[PDB]
Design a binder for this molecule. Structure first.
Ligand SMILES: O=C(O)CNC(=O)C(=O)O
Ligand SMILES: [Mg+2]
Ligand code: NI
Ligand SMILES: [Zn+2]
Length: 331
């Protein structure tokens, strides 16, 4: 069995190996990369996502989200308070202000310590989940706006044609902006490219151990657990590495820098934070190996998780018994 300790693997494809996306994912899996839940892909030196980032300031963040925390430093939830619209140039200036900027630090480890110690005492503003792309149309390799669609994969594997579309999302971050512990909708893969700016730190639980994380979360968030049998689908709970270590939960950590891709694998729980002003692009995708995860994915039916149009068909075809209850949650 490849990668039996479920370590995060880093890949350096050549420009020739960067042509065929599906084939490279399958290669990474042949080496055990999925066992970690997360992999890093450093593009060949010849590749670029676009020519420059000099002209992005007029993109609109229609609903910036202020991430307000409740709890204790290592075990907290966050809610998102909607703020007034602002441009990317206005958001960059805000991120760089004295109130929000990254503090002085020695190295990534010192910054990580400061994040865990102090996150809860601040409410950073995240420009998350903005439909769009920063890949140039002429970039042919690993262009997240030109991937094979999940609907087409379901049709190729299962023979059923379904409605829905699959497009990328932009994330504009600042110091302390946070992504809570989650797997993807329908336990899909995700791919994330850090276009510019400061790093993003990730934490991940191997898929084979995801239920250990769920059991800890039910213990640590006991009211949430009673409200919903899949409350981590709400994407609001944070648990620190120190707390995970104290409770024996297997995980790994890695920092992504500008110009690097991350792939999350089906049922790989992940969480993390931004080091300073940055912009990432991400999209979900599927492979043949996903189908079995999609059929077994948990679902939130309490009404909180509220998701895209295109998840309807995935539930309806892969999980027909759950469909009725899940759709009640959506309505
Ligand atoms: O970058 C973020 O805020 C969150 N991203 C992801 O969870 C992902 O790419 O799967
Ligand atoms: Mg612009
Ligand atoms: Ni994710
Ligand atoms: Zn729920």
């Amino acid at each position: 069995a490849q990668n039996p300790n479920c370590n995060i693997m880093i890949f350096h494809p050549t420009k020739e190996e960067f042509n065929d996306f599906d084939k490279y994912i399958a290669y990474m899996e042949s080496q055990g990369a999925h066992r970690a839940g997360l992999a890093k892909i450093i593009p060949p030196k010849e590749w670029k996502a676009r020519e420059t980032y000099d002209n992005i300031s007029e993109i609109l963040i229609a609903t910036p989200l202020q991430q307000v925390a409740s709890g204790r430093a290592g075990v907290f939830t966050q809610y998102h308070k909607k703020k007034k619209a602002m441009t990317v140039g206005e958001y960059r200036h805000l991120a760089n202000s004295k109130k929000y900027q990254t503090p002085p630090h020695q190295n990534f480890e010192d910054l990580e310590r400061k994040y865990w110690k102090n996150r809860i005492y601040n409410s950073p503003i995240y420009g998350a989940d903005i439909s769009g792309s920063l890949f140039d149309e002429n970039t042919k390799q690993w262009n997240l706006g030109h991937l094979g669609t999940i609907q087409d994969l379901l049709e190729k594997e299962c023979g059923v044609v379904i409605e829905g579309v699959n497009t990328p999302y932009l994330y504009f971050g600042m110091w302390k902006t946070t992504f809570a512990w989650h797997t993807e909708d329908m336990d899909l893969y995700s791919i994330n490219y850090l276009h510019l700016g400061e790093p993003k730190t990730w934490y991940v639980v191997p898929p084979e151990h995801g239920q250990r994380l769920e059991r800890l979360a039910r213990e640590l968030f006991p009211g949430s657990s009673r409200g919903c049998g899949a409350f981590l689908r709400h994407k609001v709970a944070l648990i620190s590495p120190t707390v995970l270590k104290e409770n024996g939960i297997p995980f790994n950590r890695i920092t992504q820098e500008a110009g690097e891709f991350m792939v999350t694998f089906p049922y790989g729980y992940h969480a993390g934070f931004n080091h300073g002003f940055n912009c990432a692009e991400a999209i979900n995708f599927a492979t043949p190996r996903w189908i079995d995860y999609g059929k077994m994915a948990s679902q939130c039916s309490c009404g909180e998780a509220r998701v895209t149009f295109s998840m309807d068909a995935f539930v309806r075809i892969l999980q027909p018994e759950r469909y009725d209850l899940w759709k009640r949650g959506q309505d």
